[PDB]
Design an enzyme around this catalytic site. Structure first.
Site, PDB file in Angstrom:
ATOM      1  N   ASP A  25       3.353   4.948   5.501  1.00  0.00           N
ATOM      2  CA  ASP A  25       2.595   3.846   4.976  1.00  0.00           C
ATOM      3  C   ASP A  25       1.518   3.476   5.692  1.00  0.00           C
ATOM      4  OD1 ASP A  25       5.311   3.802   3.734  1.00  0.00           O
ATOM      5  OD2 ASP A  25       5.802   1.959   4.570  1.00  0.00           O
ATOM      6  N   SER A  80      -3.021   0.552   6.741  1.00  0.00           N
ATOM      7  CA  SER A  80      -1.569  -0.120   6.505  1.00  0.00           C
ATOM      8  C   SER A  80      -1.694  -0.294   4.961  1.00  0.00           C
ATOM      9  CB  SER A  80      -1.486  -1.169   6.994  1.00  0.00           C
ATOM     10  OG  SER A  80      -0.415  -1.793   6.548  1.00  0.00           O
ATOM     11  N   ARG A  81      -0.548  -0.727   4.592  1.00  0.00           N
ATOM     12  CA  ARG A  81      -0.346  -0.961   3.012  1.00  0.00           C
ATOM     13  C   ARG A  81      -0.596  -2.728   2.654  1.00  0.00           C
ATOM     14  NH1 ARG A  81      -1.382   3.428   3.228  1.00  0.00           N
ATOM     15  NH2 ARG A  81      -0.784   4.797   1.772  1.00  0.00           N
ATOM     16  N   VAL A  82       0.503  -3.379   3.529  1.00  0.00           N
ATOM     17  CA  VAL A  82       0.598  -4.649   2.818  1.00  0.00           C
ATOM     18  C   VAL A  82      -0.294  -5.668   3.427  1.00  0.00           C
ATOM     19  CG1 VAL A  82       2.740  -6.144   2.529  1.00  0.00           C
ATOM     20  CG2 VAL A  82       3.066  -3.825   3.121  1.00  0.00           C
TER      21      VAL A  82
END
Ligand code: ATP
Ligand code: ADP
Ligand code: MG
Lengths: 539, 523
Positions: free
Chosen positions: B364, B389-391
């Site tokens: 991720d 990153s992702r979130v």
């Protein structure tokens, strides 16, 4: 009648038959397994033997186990009840709500729709991203591609395109998960129950989407045919119902990789660099089934992971012939901090022509292409000169060009959970003249970053007003500030008397349901009669 | 010459039998004169045709499956990876010198199981469950399926818990999650082991504070690391006390291939127990490229077709289900977590290397550690412009989360102006100040090896360069001024921000005053 598995090599298993061998691309079943296992035959070995591919893991197949013939290709249950369902490759519920409330199972392997029933009428699909709808305008019922590296922002465009077009259509759509992460799979399930596309209860029949998920955990039998399982339920809603259905397939490259992981394992020499020899009929058979005919409409949305931004690998270099509208994602524009990082040069669609849309759309997007190509051919030489001798005719197509790379940006509705700024649903003719203005010089008066993450021409003039005020703000340093204790500020220890009492117990709760059994000190084996014995002590 | 001619050959058409009456009489004395040269016919057992180097080819074994542990007659354990027509290719766990042509192969029937549970907290086994730490066999443990597929879509929930690493280079610049798959991709000898071990010692000294429901236990998987380095990290885990909450599976390079091939697989078999029973789990799959070389050894002896860089076809599927079984479950199964650290060493800067393009697409977020940044003073040598990153939000400290946008975007312009220092410009008080800011940001964001500093000291430490308090301090001595910023402030203000969690205005008044109360030794 039926045969047995004769040979297991990883994820491909071999079934022998006693007469009347199964047709190619049929379905096989093994009994006594943990889950129902579907074997899809790909070639005949020659000695009454089909060679298969495994929809789930083969770890557990005994040599000689009973294999029946369904005599038919893979059948998924298609239907209107399949909306609001998370679907497998082989027709299963994996959202744990009963069986699939549908009938009329259909063969998911078929021929492409023919040349006579092809649609040539083209309609501009206005999305709501200012770099899409100006530069690479999508086609209604056409093809939408999405390249880019791992970490450039492909999948966050896709759910943003769902919120753009798959909500404001009313009909049906399909999300075809082909070998992506479960994280972007599970999160999309929550943000469609809350957005109301998929419903739970007794309103399952008014929903708008089916989810066909072949995510990364499965062996490459499932990751190679979830593209087709997601496809045929979209082609079921086209011909029988007539509705326009939006196919949101993710990682088409993972469809071609899942073929290539076992294509050598079926007895074929590798092709160019190590990808599969039969990639042409694998992908070309996939793509031309996804079209729009006289009977209905399928608007394909394709995301493709490209490895390390290199478009010379033949597994995406076959895809460029197969996509009308292409949104090529550059990591460089993301390294500039610009989202969406859509290339103004690499991303070019087929609708872009004055003979279809109109000269007012084609000329500004071409006018974008002049000012952004020369900005690339000058930002090499700006590091040797510093833009100080150009005699004030090449300082105009640069200063606007430093603005227009910001004017591709937009806050996203699906991304405002981690960027903070609220998203925009931008229309077409409001920003075409808005794009036209900053090319012409009507908005030469503005600073650099007022164009960044904005919408229409109203928000760019109002980012500068706030920005202009903020250069007049923070002009004080003396007193009457937050730092004094006179107004409302308690002492530093009186914050601490409101803390909640947190308990620490030091044994951590690890012996409550764990059945702490004993394991054998000596390895347990079987005998020739099959019963369990310890090891007979002899070399 | 077809099979119907073969089935016609099943019909006898001999027309005379002037041999069969006599060859049936001299058959039995023939086989019983030479009876000593007969090994018995073996059906549900196995016997070795060919043996060598970890891949032993075994005739018979009609009862085995793919992935059944087999036991050779010397006690050596094995695994049936592929099953051919007449023979079964068996991979050999350990040294293989004891196996001859004609030795017995015993099926154990089960899928390979390595002991799991909380009684393993403090033990160092290899990838097979046998202890190497010299503390005897594992007590209060049980076996579990290492070949289990990942938790499904209905089983997971959205990640929330940030997984503090104790590193300001990580927690401010790359948002990690508790169910996020975070990749550490770099060169060799560049601090990859440094970043992973910084997370665990932080997660031990923040384990004696959190109440039972954020307690992240760690398993560190050592693949191919030499055994002195294994004793090094055991010495590092013991001398801080981290070995209490640390399991370590340690496949050396002097062991066979499949013990290295299974050691991240058995490494996640321990940590699925910590996810299943509601707790949080840390896993580090160290030297995951060297586990893939441990995969490449077995197949190329196993007559399997090679591909890119002579790696096999399914090597994406190896790393896929190795990193899909780490997750964050829903509420309906305890709410447990697993967060993943794979380690991929680039071949001195090949991001298009074959193992790299798989693991950068699975995971991720990635953390690039070039050998360039490691000698410019930046330790740990995180690349900022290339790390995603992702979130994002709700994956950092929330008070850090507001000030991170002031940290990232000013770092974004600074990486563009740092290479434009070939003219001597420093024009209009901006082309110098963003050089003046981001250089101190680099001199901010260095730290020391094996020094876990909690986030609540870092949310203050990130505030020192975003606000003023450093607008008159040199580029040479911030690395000895940051600790005096830590020391001379009131040590009770760090607890109440970690108690709060967000930058309220109620606490913002204290944090502007206390950093002028401190006096900086950079002069
Ligand atoms: N943050 C740091 N500060 C100072 N020195 C460091 C730091 N990180 C690593 N080093 C130096 O780098 C060396 C190797 O550290 P480490 O094992 O973490 O790197 P690695 O890339 O994981 O090595 P390998 O590739 O061999 O596993 C150490 O001997 C240490 O001297
Ligand atoms: N418009 C945007 N707003 C906020 N973040 C974005 C935007 N576009 C891309 N990103 C970031 O790019 C990152 C990569 O997204 P993702 O689509 O998962 O990449 P990939 O498809 O390569 O896995 C995400 O973490 C996301 O935060
Ligand atoms: Mg190391």
């Amino acid at each position: 009648d039926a045969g047995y598995v004769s040979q297991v090599i990883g994820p491909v298993v071999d079934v022998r038959f006693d007469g009347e061998l199964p047709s190619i691309l049929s379905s096989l079943e093994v009994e006594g397994h943990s889950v129902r296992l579907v074997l899809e035959v790909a070639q005949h070995m020659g000695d009454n033997t089909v060679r298969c591919i495994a929809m789930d893991s083969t770890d557990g197949l005994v040599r000689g186990q009973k294999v029946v013939d369904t005599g038919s290709p893979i059948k998924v249950p298609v239907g209107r009840g399949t909306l609001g369902r998370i679907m497998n490759v082989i027709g299963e519920p994996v959202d744990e709500q009963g069986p699939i409330d549908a009938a009329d199972i259909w063969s998911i392997h078929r021929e492409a729709p023919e040349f006579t029933e092809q649609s040539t009428e083209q309609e501009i699909l206005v999305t709501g991203i200012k770099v899409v709808d100006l530069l690479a305008p999508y086609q209604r019922g056409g093809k939408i591609g999405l390249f880019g590296g791992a970490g450039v922002g492909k999948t966050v465009l896709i759910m943003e395109l769902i919120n753009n077009v798959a909500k404001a259509h009313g009909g049906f759509s399909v999300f075809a998960g082909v070998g992506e992460r479960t994280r972007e799979g599970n999160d999309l399930y929550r943000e469609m129950i809350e957005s109301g596309v998929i419903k739970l209860g007794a309103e399952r029949g008014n929903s708008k989407c089916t989810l066909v998920y072949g995510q990364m955990n499965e062996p490459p039998g499932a990751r190679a045919r979830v593209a087709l399982t997601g496809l045929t339920v979209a082609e079921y809603f086209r011909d029988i119902e007539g509705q326009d259905v939006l196919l949101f397939v993710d990682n088409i490259f993972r469809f071609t990789q899942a073929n290539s992981e076992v294509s050598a394992l079926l007895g074929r020499i590798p092709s160019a660099v190590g990808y599969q020899p039969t990639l042409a009929t694998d992908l070309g058979g996939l793509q031309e089934r996804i079209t729009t005919t006289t009977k209905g409409s399928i608007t394909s949305v394709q995301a493709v992971y490209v490895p390390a931004d290199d478009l010379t690998d033949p597994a995406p270099a076959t895809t460029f012939a197969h996509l009308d509208a292409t949104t090529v994602l550059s990591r460089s524009i993301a390294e500039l901090g610009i989202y969406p990082a859509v290339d103004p040069l690499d991303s070019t669609s087929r609708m872009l022509n004055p003979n279809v849309i109109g000269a007012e759309h084609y000329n500004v997007a071409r006018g974008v292409q002049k000012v952004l190509q020369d900005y690339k051919n000058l930002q090499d030489i700006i590091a040797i000169l510093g833009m100080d001798e150009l005699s004030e005719e090449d300082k105009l197509t640069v200063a606007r060009a430093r603005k227009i790379q910001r004017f591709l940006s937009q806050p996203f509705q699906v991304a405002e959970v981690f960027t903070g700024t609220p998203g925009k649903y931008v229309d077409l003719a409001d920003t075409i003249s808005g794009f036209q203005g900053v090319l012409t010089g009507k908005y030469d008066d503005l600073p650099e970053m007022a164009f960044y993450m904005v919408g229409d021409i109203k928000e760019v003039k109002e980012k500068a007003d706030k920005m202009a005020k903020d250069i007049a703000s923070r002009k004080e340093a003396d007193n009457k500030k937050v730092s004094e204790e006179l107004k409302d500020i308690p002492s530093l220890d009186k914050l601490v008397s409101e803390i909640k009492e947190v308990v620490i117990e030091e044994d951590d709760g690890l012996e409550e349901d764990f059945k702490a059994e004993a394991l054998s000190s000596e390895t347990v084996v079987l005998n020739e009669e099959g019963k369990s014995v310890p090891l007979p002590k002899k070399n | 010459a077809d099979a119907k001619a073969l089935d016609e050959l099943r019909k006898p058409k001999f027309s005379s039998k002037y041999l069969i009456q006599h060859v049936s009489q001299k058959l039995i004395p023939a086989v019983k004169e030479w009876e000593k040269s007969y090994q018995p016919p073996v059906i549900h057992l196995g016997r070795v045709l060919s043996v060598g180097d970890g891949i032993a080819r075994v005739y018979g074994l009609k009862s085995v499956q793919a992935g059944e542990l087999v036991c050779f007659d010397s006690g050596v354990k094995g695994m049936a990876l592929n099953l051919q027509a007449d023979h079964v290719g068996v991979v050999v766990f350990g040294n293989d010198s004891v196996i001859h042509q004609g030795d017995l192969v015993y099926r154990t029937g089960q899928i390979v199981n390595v002991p799991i549970g909380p009684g393993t907290l403090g033990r160092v086994t290899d990838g097979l469950g046998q202890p190497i730490d010299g503390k005897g066999p594992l007590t209060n443990v049980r076996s579990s399926l290492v070949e289990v597929k990942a938790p499904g879509i209905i089983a997971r929930q959205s990640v929330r818990e940030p997984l503090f690493t104790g590193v300001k280079a990580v927690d401010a610049l790359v948002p990690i999650g508790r169910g996020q798959r975070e990749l550490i991709i770099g060169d060799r000898q560049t601090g990859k082991t440094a970043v992973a071990i910084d997370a665990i010692i932080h997660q031990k000294n923040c384990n004696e504070q959190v109440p039972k429901a954020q307690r992240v236990y760690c398993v560190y998987v050592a693949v191919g690391q030499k055994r002195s380095t294994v004793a090094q990290l055991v010495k590092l885990f013991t001398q801080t006390g981290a070995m209490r909450y640390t399991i370590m599976v340690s496949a050396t390079a002097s062991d066979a291939a499949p013990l290295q091939f299974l050691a991240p697989y058995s490494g996640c078999a321990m940590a699925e127990y910590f996810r299943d029973t509601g707790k949080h789990g840390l896993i580090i799959y160290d030297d995951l490229s060297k586990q893939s070389v441990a995969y490449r050894q077995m197949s190329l002896l196993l007559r399997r077709p090679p591909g890119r860089e002579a790696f096999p076809g399914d090597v994406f599927y190896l790393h896929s289900r190795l990193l899909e079984r780490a997750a964050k479950l829903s509420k309906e199964l305890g709410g447990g977590s697993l967060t993943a650290f794979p380690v991929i060493e680039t071949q001195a800067g090949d991001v298009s290397a074959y193992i790299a393009t798989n693991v950068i697409s699975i995971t991720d977020g990635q953390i690039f550690l070039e050998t360039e940044l490691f000698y410019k003073g930046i330790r740990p040598a995180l690349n900022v412009g290339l790390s995603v990153s992702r979130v994002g939000s709700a994956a950092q400290f929330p008070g850090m989360k507001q000030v991170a946008g002031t940290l990232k975007l000013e770092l974004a312009q600074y990486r563009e102006v740092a290479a434009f220092a070939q003219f001597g410009s420093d024009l209009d008080a901006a082309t110098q100040y963003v050089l003046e800011r981001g250089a101190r940001l680099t001199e901010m964001l260095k730290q020391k090896q094996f020094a876990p500093i909690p986030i609540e000291r870092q949310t203050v430490a990130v505030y020192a360069a975003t606000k003023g308090f450093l607008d008159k301090v040199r580029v040479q001595d911030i690395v000895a001024a940051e600790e005096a910023v830590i020391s001379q402030v009131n040590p009770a203000v760090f607890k109440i921000l970690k108690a709060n969690g967000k930058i309220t205005p109620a606490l913002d008044a204290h944090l502007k005053a206390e950093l002028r109360k401190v006096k900086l030794p950079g002069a």
